Design a protein around this ligand. Structure first.
Ligand code: NI
Ligand code: NI
Length: 479
């Protein structure tokens, strides 16, 4: 057969976590059409893949790209990492189905401003995505807080029955239109007052395979076990799978406690379906907030409106230079952004190695000085953690950003190098793949990503130029 693309002599890491092997892989249209020890076929395009890995396109299961992927369809921060699908609508906030009857509630402002929320149904969001012709695929969760906001006159209280019944119906229609499930962000003020019962009511719409429950826990600090217990209870009430978003033990007092949380996962996964994702860094990044100020670890200023030349220094250094207290120095920097070294590297590694842990970047594309995970999460797992630190073999590393993720979120025919699946594919050099993005210089494309293919269209390459606009809106696999 004449094929469109032939990948010769590649090490296939097929996304299942199984062993690797060498083969030729052929693509025709948007489908992987053949895999064999060799394929003696004429192709429009041939790539000698010797010495490279052919993997499924990476699936970023934790993004806030809802609106930005439409505004910047040639979505370089993710595509240059090898990402071919983004899952949007996380932590309780989604553009899809969100109507703004007034002020935009925190943290929906991470996605955009009031005027950008013009997608009152999943259907409307889907067609807006495809009108933008993005370079990677998009699927969406439905944001719990966005639903709250559609139905409640004020967010800072438990919802009443009538409000919750409305939310159930709106979520049902969204899942019918292909939404992948429901996200919560229960630690945020705008959802913190919700009861477990309210969330249970919405999670019930997910039963019988209609989606996954993903959750930013009600707390990622001291009471994290209690918050984990609530998530699992919600999962058991609805009989729905749970994904714990960006699982971490934050704060010096909780360092080492992933030994406890993952033990809780072990125990509870014996009776229900639970997974999680994490980003592969032990520092967080946010606005500089007085309540976060501490001398327990480095706080590094990323930018400061009040004193822009202090960026790059630690809060302690700045306080010492100014001869003031940490809090006084904080006040004099604000408004500012900061990196918080408030996670323990061993915790992050324990969570990354946990068998059901997926990789998500949790990138924030509207941040003025972005955390480098926005540009580096996936090559950082393949290069720094798998190759250099040997946290897991490369087949496992790829598994955690492809087949595992596609299965958990019910993406049809994606996440595996498999005959008959869609041709979302990454060709990368395993010896040189690496996250170039750094905290001081975050907006930098990875190295070692040699070709990225989306729905059979070659879209990105070693010259760092985008050449395809073949992304689609992905609907949940229906039964
Ligand atoms: Ni979150
Ligand atoms: Ni998030």
């Amino acid at each position: 057969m004449k094929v469109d693309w032939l990948f010769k002599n590649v090490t296939v890491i097929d996304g299942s976590g199984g062993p690797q092997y060498r083969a030729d892989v052929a693509v025709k249209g948007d489908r992987i059409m053949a895999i064999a020890p060799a394929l003696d076929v004429a192709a429009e395009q041939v790539i000698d893949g010797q010495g490279r890995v052919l993997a499924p396109g990476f699936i970023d299961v934790h993004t806030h790209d809802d609106i930005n992927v439409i505004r910047m369809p040639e979505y370089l921060p993710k595509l240059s990492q090898g990402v071919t699908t983004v899952i949007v609508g996380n932590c309780g906030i989604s553009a899809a189905t969100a109507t703004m009857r007034g002020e935009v509630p925190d943290p929906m402002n991470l996605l955009g401003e009031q005027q950008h929320f013009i997608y009152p149904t999943v259907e409307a969001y889907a067609h807006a995505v495809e009108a933008a012709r993005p370079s990677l695929n998009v699927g969406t969760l439905i944001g719990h807080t966005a639903l709250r906001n559609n139905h409640m006159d004020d967010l800072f209280r438990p919802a009443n029955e009538t409000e919750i019944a409305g939310m159930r119906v709106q979520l049902r229609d969204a899942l019918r239109q292909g939404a992948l499930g429901l996200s919560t962000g229960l630690a945020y003020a705008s959802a913190f007052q919700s009861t477990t019962e309210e969330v249970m009511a919405l999670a019930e719409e997910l039963a019988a395979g209609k989606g996954v429950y993903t959750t930013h826990l009600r707390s990622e600090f001291e009471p994290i076990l209690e918050a984990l217990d609530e998530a699992f209870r919600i999962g058991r009430h609805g009989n729905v799978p749970v994904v714990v978003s960006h699982h971490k033990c934050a704060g010096a007092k909780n360092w080492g406690r992933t030994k406890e949380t993952l033990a809780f996962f072990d125990e509870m996964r014996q009776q229900q379906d639970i997974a999680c994702d994490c980003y592969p860094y032990s520092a967080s990044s946010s606005t500089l907030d007085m309540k976060q100020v501490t001398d327990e670890f480095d706080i590094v200023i990323t930018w400061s409106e009040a004193q822009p030349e202090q960026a790059g220094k630690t809060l302690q250094q700045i306080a010492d230079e100014w001869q003031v207290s940490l809090h006084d120095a904080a006040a004099r920097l604000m408004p500012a952004g900061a990196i918080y070294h408030n996670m323990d590297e061993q915790d992050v590694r324990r969570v990354m190695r946990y068998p059901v842990t997926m990789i998500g970047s949790d990138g924030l594309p509207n941040d003025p000085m972005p955390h480098p995970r926005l540009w580096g999460a996936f090559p950082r797992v393949l290069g720094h953690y798998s190759r250099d630190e040997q946290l897991f073999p490369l087949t496992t590393a790829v598994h955690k950003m492809t087949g595992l993720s596609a299965a958990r979120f019910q993406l049809a025919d994606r996440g595996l190098v498999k005959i008959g699946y869609f041709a979302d594919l990454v060709l990368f050099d395993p010896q040189t793949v690496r996250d170039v993005a750094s905290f001081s210089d975050p907006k930098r494309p990875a190295d070692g990503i040699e070709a990225v293919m989306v729905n059979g269209v070659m879209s990105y390459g070693s010259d760092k130029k985008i050449t395809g606009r073949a992304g689609r809106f992905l609907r949940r696999r229906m039964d």
